[PDB]
Design a protein around this ligand. Structure first.
Ligand SMILES: Nc1ncnc2c1ncn2[C@@H]1O[C@H](CSCC[C@H](N)C(=O)O)[C@@H](O)[C@H]1O
Ligand SMILES: [Zn+2]
Ligand SMILES: [Zn+2]
Length: 883
């Protein structure tokens, strides 16, 4: 016997177009989305508006008592986030995690600053069917797709309930999952079993058009299932006759704005150390100083806030001359997605809360000892044929570029427009001389960190630009005290390969491949290139204690200055950063922390290299059965560690290649793939993998990623061989066609395009698309125009391409004449003699040789280039690099 709902769907389909239109809204309740859609069309994220209707559905279920949200809220099919953003406003809710399918056709999560947005984490591109269930407190799901055939809605609704059946197996205290088709005979005793097993009932939310029978399976309900589904069918059937009734209008929920207070687990401040700097900042902005009860800092100590103007932008321009010369890539999402990052207060605080506001537990006691042994042995190793020294002011002057950040904080430090101007003002060196005096008296007065978002070219997130990574540096006078105490590590090349065996400091991309090729000649197992997830946030206070052991090899007075710069600046940090507030105003927060590593410290690269070496040196020990599982707690016989280093330490170092946090290790066997107890206990958890799954290695060294590239071995036409770097072509092109500028002129972007083109000729000459596209750009840009900009942030991209000199002449200097891996120094005089990658690897790394749209782009490039010359201006002087 067909159910009442099946007779409702029978009539619903038999209606005509006009019958349907009169019935869809007849007598339903509806929220007022007018004054919300406009603010959302303008970009007003501080308006307290809800991102969709579904937010008002959730409130109705809450007021009635059907839903009691709390704890970790998981929101399957969160859409724009209507359910997630409302959940983050409830008193008992403390974490919101929503997932949705993105891409074309589907809604992507919105970015709004409603109340509690800091506890929200939305992720797109997720298909919840292929997503394993995790424990949670509140489970939300709003995933159906209406159709017209009840056999499809039943099939789709059954498929949904087989997916949420795994999540409910984890016993969530509250849930609200959407049943799209509850009215069929099969769907009724599918729900009858699920109600016996998990409880709750079916509720019909009046904020729903009469054209769907959808009901929500909520936890605070207990109405009988057939009675629930059928009573709704009688309402929907009854509305099909006769008169059309008015729609009742409610007022939309207003979620508010700001952040919400959070449980604090931050370490106890050392107000004897950082107290003077906090007082100095508070007194400077004393007129607007206050304490915000709603600050979002879990693992940083909070000291106060004051009103401040906003900084940064979320805008990203396009390079017109690269975009025209790279037409066939306008349909590749691999390049069209690359756009600048978002450095506004919201843009960085959004990434800060998830990535930098963390707290890794202290390593165990045996671990902490092994670290101390290996680190003290590594400093003694590095400092054998090399001694620490104090660097001078005369050195620091000749090392500040034009774009060295001043970075003042206190009013006395705000007297100069540029850094090179300040370093010539004797008042500047008076502030330094005055600060070092405080250091020698055990105090610190000026050394405070500036934090902000780094401006990069990365793949977008949702529809918009991705949030920004944090960079932090101190004011110029404090950065000099840093330099004269620890700068010897950089200026004396402690981390170079000659001194450390495993370092690579100072080298460029044009030489790293020869190190991996040499590393493959020694015997052993596969190569391993695991990466720590967010390295600068795992540098514990014990990692910092071990780095401070360099001060043992110092003259006593030099040890004093370094310890003042370490005890007051590295082991205690006073950070200044912006945050959005309630109402659109932006505010400055003063926070403090006692672990992690600042990105802009003078010795960041050197110390990250040191600690990463110590990490891989220990992981070799666990893999060779020197350290056991009892050793993590209490170090058994410590003499067994000192002997493994004295016998094999220098050889394992020769088997590595470490640049900062990036590393590649060639162990002696594949036990290194599953030596993880010390790796995890030190906080150095690996990236994009499960915390205990053994790692994967490469049998082929021409595939190992290192410093964002891999390296292939090529052979010049007749004879010699070079080892070149290579990466996926889509991000090389994609970065080149995004211009960082804020309204640049045509001449100025055409210069930025000559930089990406000439860099390609130097490092990626072996990519058929880039070799052609670089000649096309260099033919469309005037010859005498000098390249501007920055085509890479890599410390290994040295920049031999930022020149007007002939590119073939700077090519020979880099790859032949000044390449020590080149016995024969015969010059190369024609580009046609410089080879390509194999047609297989080109395609594998993003090339489009065989595709029709690229074959046409090639044979039209001369006409394409002549069209670009009129756009730069055909009265300029051009050369024909295309032949
Ligand atoms: N298999 C799947 N995996 C993840 N998301 C899916 C999915 N199938 C559909 N979706 C998404 O789930 C969303 C449900 S709409 C619900 C959104 C939310 N209630 C709000 O108030 O905004 C749709 O946007 C759809 O794109
Ligand atoms: Zn100081
Ligand atoms: Zn490649």
């Amino acid at each position: 016997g067909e159910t009442l709902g099946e007779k409702w769907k029978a009539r619903l389909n038999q209606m005509s177009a006009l019958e349907f239109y009169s019935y869809k809204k007849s007598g339903i309740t509806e929220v007022c989305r007018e004054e919300a859609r406009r603010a959302l069309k303008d970009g007003v994220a501080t308006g307290g508006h809800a991102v969709s209707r579904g937010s008002a559905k959730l409130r109705w279920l809450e007021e009635r008592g059907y839903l009691q949200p709390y704890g970790k809220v998981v929101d399957l099919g969160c859409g724009r986030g209507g359910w997630s953003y409302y959940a983050a406003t409830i008193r008992k809710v403390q974490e919101v995690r929503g997932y949705t399918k993105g891409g074309p056709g589907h809604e992507e999560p919105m970015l709004v600053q409603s109340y509690g947005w800091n506890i929200v984490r939305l992720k797109s591109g997720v298909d919840v069917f292929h997503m394993a269930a995790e424990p949670c407190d509140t489970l939300l799901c709003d995933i159906g797709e209406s159709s017209s055939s009840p056999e499809v809605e039943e099939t789709r609704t059954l498929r949904v309930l087989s997916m949420v059946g795994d999540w409910l197996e984890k016993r969530p205290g509250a849930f609200c999952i959407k049943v799209l088709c509850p009215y069929t005979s099969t769907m009724m005793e599918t729900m009858e079993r699920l109600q016996r097993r998990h409880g709750g009932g079916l509720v019909r939310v009046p904020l729903s058009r009469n054209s769907t029978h959808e009901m929500y399976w909520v936890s605070g309900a207990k109405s009988n299932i057939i009675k629930s589904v059928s009573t709704t069918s009688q309402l929907l059937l009854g509305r099909m006759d006769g008169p059309r009734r008015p729609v009742k209008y409610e007022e939309d929920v207003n979620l508010g704005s700001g952040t919400r207070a959070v449980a604090s687990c931050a370490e106890a401040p050392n107000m004897k150390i950082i107290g003077r700097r906090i007082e100095r900042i508070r007194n400077e902005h004393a007129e607007t100083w206050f304490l915000d009860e709603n600050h979002p800092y879990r693992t940083w100590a909070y000291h106060g806030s004051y009103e401040a103007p906003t900084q940064g932008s979320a805008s990203s321009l396009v390079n017109g001359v690269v975009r025209l010369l790279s037409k066939p890539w306008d349909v590749v999402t691999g390049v069209t997605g690359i756009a600048m990052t978002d450095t506004t207060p919201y843009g960085q605080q959004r990434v800060f809360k998830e990535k930098v506001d963390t707290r890794v537990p202290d390593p165990q006691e045996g671990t902490r000892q092994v670290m101390n042994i290996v680190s003290s042995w590594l400093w003694k190793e590095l400092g054998k044929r090399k001694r620490p020294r104090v660097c001078t002011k005369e050195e620091f002057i000749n090392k500040v570029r034009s774009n060295a950040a001043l970075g003042a904080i206190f009013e006395e430090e705000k007297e100069w427009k540029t850094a090179v101007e300040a370093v010539n003002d004797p008042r500047f060196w008076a502030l330094v001389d005055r600060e070092r005096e405080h250091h020698l008296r055990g105090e610190c007065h000026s050394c405070v960190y500036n934090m902000m978002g780094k401006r990069e070219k990365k793949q977008g997130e949702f529809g918009k630009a991705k949030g920004s990574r944090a960079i932090w540096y101190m004011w110029l006078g404090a950065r000099f005290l840093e330099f004269e105490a620890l700068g010897f590590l950089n200026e004396d090349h402690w981390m170079g390969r000659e001194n450390s065996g495993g370092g690579v400091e100072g080298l460029g991309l044009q030489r790293l491949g020869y190190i991996l090729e040499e590393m493959n000649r020694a015997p052993g197992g596969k190569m391993y290139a695991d990466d720590t997830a967010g390295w600068d946030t795992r540098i514990s206070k014990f990692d910092l204690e071990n780095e401070a052991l360099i001060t043992n090899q110092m003259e006593e007075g030099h040890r004093t200055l370094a310890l003042a710069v370490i005890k007051y600046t590295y082991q205690n940090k006073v950070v200044k950063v912006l945050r959005p507030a309630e109402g659109g105003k932006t505010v400055m927060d003063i926070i403090s922390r006692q672990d992690q590593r600042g990105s802009g410290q003078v010795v960041t690269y050197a110390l990250n290299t040191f600690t990463n070496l110590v990490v891989q040196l220990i992981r070799n020990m666990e893999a060779e059965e020197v350290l056991e599982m009892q050793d993590l707690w209490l170090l058994r016989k410590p003499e067994k560690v000192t002997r493994w280093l004295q016998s094999n330490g220098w050889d394992r170092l020769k088997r590595m290649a470490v640049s900062g946090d990036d590393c590649v290790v060639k162990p002696i066997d594949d036990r290194f793939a599953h030596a993880l107890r010390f790796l995890n206990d030190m906080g150095k958890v690996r990236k994009d993998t499960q915390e205990w799954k053994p790692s994967t290695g490469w049998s082929n060294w021409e595939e190992v990623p290192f410093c964002s590239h891999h390296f292939n071995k090529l052979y010049l036409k007749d004879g010699r061989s070079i080892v070149v770097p290579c990466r996926h072509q889509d991000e090389l092109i994609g970065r080149a066609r995004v211009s960082p500028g804020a309204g640049w002129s045509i001449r100025e972007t055409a210069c930025l395009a000559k930089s990406y083109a000439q860099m390609w000729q130097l490092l990626y000459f072996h990519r058929r698309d880039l070799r052609l596209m670089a000649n096309a750009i260099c033919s469309a840009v005037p010859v005498d125009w000098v390249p501007t900009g920055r085509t890479t942030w890599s410390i290994h991209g040295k920049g031999e391409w930022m020149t007007t000199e002939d590119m073939l002449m700077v090519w020979n200097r880099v790859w032949i004449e000044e390449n020590d891996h080149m016995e024969d120094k015969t010059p190369v005089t024609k580009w046609t003699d410089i080879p390509y990658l194999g047609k297989r690897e080109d395609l594998w790394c993003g090339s489009l040789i065989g595709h029709r749209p690229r074959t046409t782009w090639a044979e039209n490039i001369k006409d394409t280039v002549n069209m670009v010359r009129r756009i730069i201006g055909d009265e300029e002087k051009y050369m024909d690099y295309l032949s």
